[PDB]
């Protein structure tokens, strides 16, 4: 439209309206010129002594928008206002918009950089609606709209790993190359704006409630069962039985079973550091799966377990999600202690899921004769059994919203190990890059031009989601537990900028606070 | 209708029409008089030293039509034209028709056989629409319309095993006898024709595409994760963490897991014969399940694995489908080398399923103290876990189309271990027999007549199926892999008759050629 | 319909109606069971010392109907009545019909054959409408409806050669196998009949007239030309000219040129046998073309030449069509003298085409200086030049009607070297075979049945063509030449059966009798 006329406004709010809440977030982004407008074949061999780190892929000159973290849509006070009052929620719509673009031309002429703004330069933008490109948004990768609205962020570079050969850095005949210029983009100059809308498929609500009943204590503790149980054998080998009394839950007949489990190791946090074994490189002793002759660590393991038992300091670290209070810089290989790290705890599920560092149970190892005695054998892993129930991992303010389910054809219970909603058709990926502008060419050459003017672009992005809520209707009498701002001797305010202007976040707020009778 | 007037024509073609293809095949069959028009109680005791080979059942005087193999509807050139251009397909309809029947009366009088044609003899035909009879069509049994149209085939005899007692050849009180004359058939003389139509329930498409991304390399290899991971313990027992860098897929947090697995043994094909252990009777060392006190080999194991790792000669033979190039005769107990055998390979799934001869992974065996060190224990079998994905076995031109799901009431993921579509109500079984004509009886006898005129029948059968296709829409740039007629120094043409007139087929054409970004 | 009711009548006549003539011919055929209902891969290596005789192909169990010879539609008296009165003709329609079928079952039981007729057996019939099969009808092959209506004929076996490798009997990766059962046929029992109609594309008339003017004598022989011609050089090197007088056709300026030519060798017929060189194996000294490293004799050479010069006994045998008076048996490798052979002569074209055993002309070999003298060099081959005219080979009563033009994409002047009409879509091929009836099978076997009852079929075929004629309108005064029954001391009547009942034909009647002023 016009140079001296704004393309859009800054909308950033929330609007609770009964069983729906619409959130809105605007942010300023900056897009570098990655790979000097080229495609490069990136590849790696086995690093760290693990050929699972060996890949082969392509880095493109595009950047993408990632809105896959909760704190990109919710403020800490609107999150709290949700987890204290509702039993669940699920996304219903999405509507992204890019506007107020500005392309800047950088020039380092004379060992001195001068930033002037180009008014005729464009920016390319397209959304992958049919899922024809490798999805990279739902894998816990950095680069999402910052948590704090004032913060400006750089868009991350697009790239993807494709099939490599024999755990090496070479390709196979099936390795594919996707050209992103082969998609119909839209071009934008300073006066234009891009819009895009989407609507989620039905997905089941997330359950933001914790159970207030043990799964193996569902029976009435006053009435006895009309069922008997084999208790022992007499001297005559004759089998004897005994009735299941009331309150004796160790012996009652059950109807439902806890869910899957896979033992991990447990490590004690600070308080008990003394107990933990000294100097142990976990890699060698971690839970790992093999895929094509390579060993990959499967953190955070499949759903159906609790990393900790409420009341203890021991932790199943490989079944845990570990974030970082203070954001970090790319390429950091520094070793950090637990202090500035937010170890999430899923213990409000202990009533239904099993601890990840204990044996799942015991079963029989043989057959008793007039000779051999009955023997039991504890097991460390048990998968899904018919009639089992479990609770899924919880979502955090600083955690991921959705994940894309791989379209292989067959899958069981599509719920991402990192929490969130599993989707067959998740929000499209929105790529963007700066259309290249050639330097001073002066003669023909069937060779492509490699001299480009260095540029970068800035702009705003507004993303407005709509969520559906599930009202809590409990007849609990006494008061419940809520998420509260409980600090002692505060030297700073949490979820707010400190003296220098850097945003602080010392807590990981989850979602399971309210309760429900199993 | 009439003797000197044909009941139907010979339709045999294919007709591609966008997202649908209709195939049609006609063939000539011959029906012997099995069991001299009687029902016999067939039974066997433990043979080969395995009481699992002990059964009890009934052989009937009926024969049936089996269209449960792909190469009964597709030519090698129409198969190829499908697997190179589509991402999947599924059957939509069926329409069988029997016509141009001819009953012949054989007579060996005077040590010399004279074949004359009986014009008044009938043939009985009925389709089991309610699934009231034991289904025997989807179990990989011979007897299907030949691959080559010119070939004439004999219909196989119907029979079934019912409950036997204590792994013996005796019946139980629950053993059932089904009388097939107790169904309303239709009778046909030379001028009549039988028709029958059917339509499949919705079934999910088969996925004829291979993934072009590893399941554990879905993250962007340029951006790092905002998650940390327990890496080791300090001398103070204090736990230390480290950030998940980019491209280090051995350590990233994953969202999805590979599918089920059950270790089988792996044997090296020719090239590596030297490595294989010498003289091993597999039975004793094979994967077996127990059902009622008997050990059965479970080949080809459940879905979710790859029999081989692309680039190697090693094979998980018990997880493999093994066909035969040159068709064989009934009762052959000869030992064959790999040469004339088509060992199918499911490696275009290696990116998502695990190899069947490697350990599935490692997990923890204990709990580390200030005393005990962390220990891991490799596992050989792991079943379905929540959030796992796998790809189903592929279909072959020479393999089965569908299978009937047992109507027990409870089942998980109904997909036949041998590939194809699992159906609750599969195409009805079509039985047929020659109505008996008595010899010269001359006096009453309350005893049934046992003297019959020997006869046989011939005729044509046309089966026309309709399939639905799933168009491929990929934005891959470089060229894909296709199924091509790549032979070197051909001494004969494949998929064509040789000097003597015998049909040759040296390859097993599968379905997974195209690719898709996971 | 019915057994005791005829399917069709015997129509065999001609009906002249102005500018159209409709011919009709019925005949009785017999169809053997070729290849015992099988497909065989036929192949040959280099035979006769020529690797051009090495092929690789397939013989099928089908037979076909061939109506590609003129004497299958015309009687000698209706042919004569055409070539004496019209200036040309061309086919307009076609309409074949098969009826009154009868399948017979042969039995050699007891060293004694008994032919009984099977009333339930069928016969399969289909026409290749889209030209998807190798066409073999227009290559001068035997097997066409006999010349004489009373004669019964056996249908010839279908087969075709496909690509062979390096002039050997092995196939290439491109060698194709066509299954004829893969086409939708129609089945016929004794009471049924098959019909089929077709209409030719526009094709230019054949020109059944000879020119009555030399191509180089078109000018008026009374008037002189206003053009001069370089005649010589004076002693001064000065060039001199002279006017083109009247009647001096050796020197006139011409406007049109004779057509293509390629010198062959000329051999004298009987009268001059003495002159011919003694004992010469032509193969080594014949006109041959090379295609893929093999030498093939190109008889009868391309159009545009006359095999003989009217008034001489010399013959360009390789540019000649040689038929046989008395029909012969298959596999005869006997050497025959000219006597019972009909050597066609194309001399009524000598006014426009050049003799095939003379040098085509002379041209210049150098450049004359004050030193070198002018030299000429006779040429033996000259192809098409702009502004050239020629006349095509003539058609004979015993010769072919049409030919199919290969669908390569590029071609020049599509007129078959053997005469007739070149067609892009010629009359479809009509294949037919006896549906197989199995012997006494008694047990299942996944192996195809190989025991068949020996049968053969008989029936009638009526083919009715419509032709368009071009009326002659000449203002010639004196009488023309006609084809007349001019024999002297006839010991038998020509074109009629002799004492034994064998049809005689001592002449090859062509088509060029009438004349036209060039």
Author numbering:
A (entry chain A), B (entry chain A), C (entry chain A): 209 to 726
Publication text:
Adeno-associated virus (AAV) is a small ssDNA satellite virus of high interest (in recombinant form) as a safe and effective gene therapy vector. AAV’s human cell entry receptor (AAVR) contains polycystic kidney disease (PKD) domains bound by AAV. Seeking understanding of the spectrum of interactions, goat AAVGo.1 is investigated, because its host is the species most distant from human with reciprocal cross-species cell susceptibility. The AAV5 clade also includes AAVGo.1 (18, 19), which was isolated from deceased neonatal domesticated goat ileum.
Cryo-EM single particle analysis (SPA) yielded a reconstruction at 2.9 Å resolution for AAVGo.1. The capsid core, comprising a jellyroll fold found in many virus structures, and a single α-helix (αA), is the most conserved feature of AAVs, and AAVGo.1 is no exception. The AAVGo.1 core jellyroll has the standard topology with a backbone chain alternating between two stacked antiparallel β-sheets (almost rolling into a single tube). AAVGo.1 and AAV5 capsid proteins have high homology (94%). DE loop (VR-II), which forms the outer edge of the pore-like structure of the 5-fold axis, protrudes an additional 1.5 Å compared to AAV5. In conclusion, AAVGo.1 amino acid differences account for displacements up to 3.0 Å in VR-II and VR-V compared to the atomic structure of AAV5. AAVGo.1 residues Thr477 to Ser482 are of below-average order in the sharpened maps of AAVGo.1 alone.
